[PDB]
Symmetry: C2
Subunit: 445 residues, 2 copies
């Protein structure tokens, strides 16, 4: 039995180095093992990707044609990151030049006058470019806030709630958003009712109780989607941090109608690991999807910033998938050198950043970290059962649809560590430097 | 809502310090949380304990009468560790003065000439003393090796296997052992077919294929136990390290006869964490028990060795229970100053060691670590759902039969760490020093 080993040694700036390797008959000793049992498959995953925001779009539009091509190939080429998922905003989010909605007054609403010109200039070009490289990407759309006049606070920023008498109107706008994008060759396959429905932000935000969020999904979105023949659309709820996952799910799915009309829950990583809540729901709601929909790290200039970011991405991804996660979607795919533009000054790092002045593209550690997963695991693959002799050696494995085994191993220890990947009567000894990560690919004999 | 907090700092050696504490209404911020959901109960646990071996018995017998009482109280008093489980060997194990069997020729067995002199002299006195403090202890017996003449290698040591024509006779000896102990007021409630059935040791050992081990349990042990009115006896298989747990269970429980006659699997920690395998079985075999039956650390006198031992016990215990474990049984309860007696020089540390030179008893760090669990969690308790924002802050919670909530938290980080235990709309902020451990006790309002 043989395979391919892709190894990264961040402290030496060595990333995704591939080389041919071969397994050997296993030794009797059972120490330092990372046992893999490909025959025992767990949950199915839908893919990996990042987010298209007005900010990312504006930065993309500012790239030279040469850079645009390089950027798109790096992320969407089947020979590179092969991104298969994506998330985008319905109207403005903080990563926009400013607030914007598809309709700004009750009068324009009544007269049916909507405007998508802004998305057509800032978002669609980037999305269309990506779709050219991978026309089969599964796209998800989520709102940060309904138009100002449809809210109790008359402001897209600062929280507030959707006025009860505007539920139908907001749902109708979302349908037009979908029709608008379909006209430009962009098909959406998933939606979330609202980004962080329980959190007030100084930027675009809107609050919904669990009863309100689920009612909007089942009573308003579902019937309309069906009438448009968009029955297969997936709808996710929560779309917030992992600490409140179980509490929300419990309340939401207690109602049979919600269980039937909602596909699963989306979650973020801003409050930490909380992997146990993903696992509990994976066991209680085996037929629902638990999607990681957003995460990012701040801009930091100290010596250890890149290594810390590397850890944050790998640690959360491995834990999520080992716990029942159905997919991974990073936040902004791209941002400028300072981590913008953001209309509220909430600057953040993105795996790829671009400097327009010198027309220089930069790949941060996180880009390579995500790569240990996305470059090798395909949509439809299932996580496989595996175990590690030491929790500091983080690991998770998958079996692609074609049977290819894929194992990701990350050493969070501050020392070089060893392990023996054991698959039945075959094994391969690996040595990882501190913070090193390796992806092993192989097929049954 | 009030509670009790028991805190330990292994470096400063301030163990199990208790103080009254109070929860406060939760703050809106959701960072640094260890979320607990008592309403969601997981697996039930049977208790905590240690092992009685000839070695431990000899050391116990060597103590002064005052030290014997101190020792017994520390481990079995309801006001101390309150051990509720125990494991002991059927015939000799490595922690014995030497090899010994209850009979050594088919002729003597045939005529009922068995000898329990050594058990009566070295094991029964210790066991009886413990039973005096806790008459309801759940005792488990496991063999390391059948008599030499019943094996293919005619040696209790060095592996070999039970001769097929001796299955009935070995089973009878086991029954005789049970009747011998019963006549001495000692009732056994559980058995394992063989200690480490796939491992050859320089000391007492015996190999069994999974087919052989299960057949012995179902085809020979069960019938005999039933005819003696011991049908309630629990039988465990595997009784080895966690790395081969799923593989063995898969093969054993594929047969209906085995599923109906075997109560679960026992396991050790000698090859590392491998927590995922416990979790997988907890999901696939929800009605079977996954018991941790043995573990110990070697004698080590280098700097910080006590902290490492403290870590080993707490880390494995927390991981096991979070993953589906039904109980904890430590290896030798007591050993001499050097970590013996052991007839193969396999010296190990025990939570309590006795120095016969000056009649001094010493409690190692591991004793206190185990206490964070055993002094507060009662048999029949159920693990509760909980999650941590940072897995370096290891934690597991329980709900005792009387409703008391118990949360164990261990900080494996190298710096002081903070966390907010969140129970519904109530919280309590805790600060743990490096390697610190805390047990929080409380009841619902």
């Amino acid at each position: 039995m043989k395979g391919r080993l892709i190894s990264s040694d961040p402290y030496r700036q060595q990333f995704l180095v591939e080389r041919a390797v071969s397994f050997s008959h296993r030794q009797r000793d059972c120490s330092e093992l990372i046992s893999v049992l490909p025959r025992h498959a767990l949950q199915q995953i839908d893919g990996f990707g990042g987010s298209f925001t007005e900010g990312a779009g504006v930065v993309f539009n500012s790239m030279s044609e040469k850079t645009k091509a390089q950027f798109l190939s790096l992320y969407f080429s089947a020979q590179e990151h092969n991104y298969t998922l994506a998330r985008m905003p319905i109207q403005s989010c903080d990563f926009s030049l400013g607030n914007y909605a598809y309709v700004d007054s009750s009068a324009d609403l009544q007269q049916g006058r909507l405007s998508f010109s802004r998305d057509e200039a800032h978002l669609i070009p980037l999305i269309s470019g990506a779709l050219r490289l991978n026309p089969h990407m599964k796209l998800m759309a989520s709102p940060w806030s309904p138009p100002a006049f449809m809210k109790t606070n008359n402001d897209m920023n600062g929280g507030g709630k959707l006025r009860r008498e505007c539920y139908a109107d907001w749902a109708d706008i979302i349908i037009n958003y979908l029709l608008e994008y379909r006209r430009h060759g962009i098909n959406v396959q998933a939606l979330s009712v609202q980004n962080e429905p329980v959190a007030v932000k100084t930027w675009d935000s809107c609050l919904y109780s669990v009863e309100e969020e689920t009612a909007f999904a089942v009573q308003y979105l579902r019937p309309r989607l069906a009438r448009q023949g968009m029955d297969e659309m997936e709808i996710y709820i929560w779309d917030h941090d992992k600490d409140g996952l179980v509490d929300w799910a419990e309340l939401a799915f207690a109602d049979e109608a919600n269980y039937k009309g909602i596909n699963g829950l989306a979650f973020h990583w801003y409050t930490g690991d909380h992997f146990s809540q993903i696992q509990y729901l994976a066991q209680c709601l085996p037929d629902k999807k638990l999607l990681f929909s957003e995460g990012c790290v701040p801009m930091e200039s100290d010596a250890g910033s890149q290594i810390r970011h590397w850890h944050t991405y790998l640690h959360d991804m491995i834990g999520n998938f080992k716990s029942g996660c159905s997919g991974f979607i990073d936040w902004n795919l791209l941002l400028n050198s300072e981590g913008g533009p953001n209309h509220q000054g909430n600057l953040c790092e993105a795996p790829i950043q671009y400097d327009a002045q010198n027309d220089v593209l930069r790949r941060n550690h996180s880009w390579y970290g995500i790569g240990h997963f996305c470059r090798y695991v395909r949509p439809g693959a299932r996580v496989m059962l595996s175990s590690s002799y030491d929790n500091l050696l983080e690991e998770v494995g998958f079996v692609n649809p074609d049977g290819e085994r894929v194992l990701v191993v990350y050493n969070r220890d501050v020392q070089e560590r060893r392990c023996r990947v054991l698959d039945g009567d075959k094994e391969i000894a690996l040595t990882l430097p501190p913070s090193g990560a390796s992806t092993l690919l192989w097929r049954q004999e």
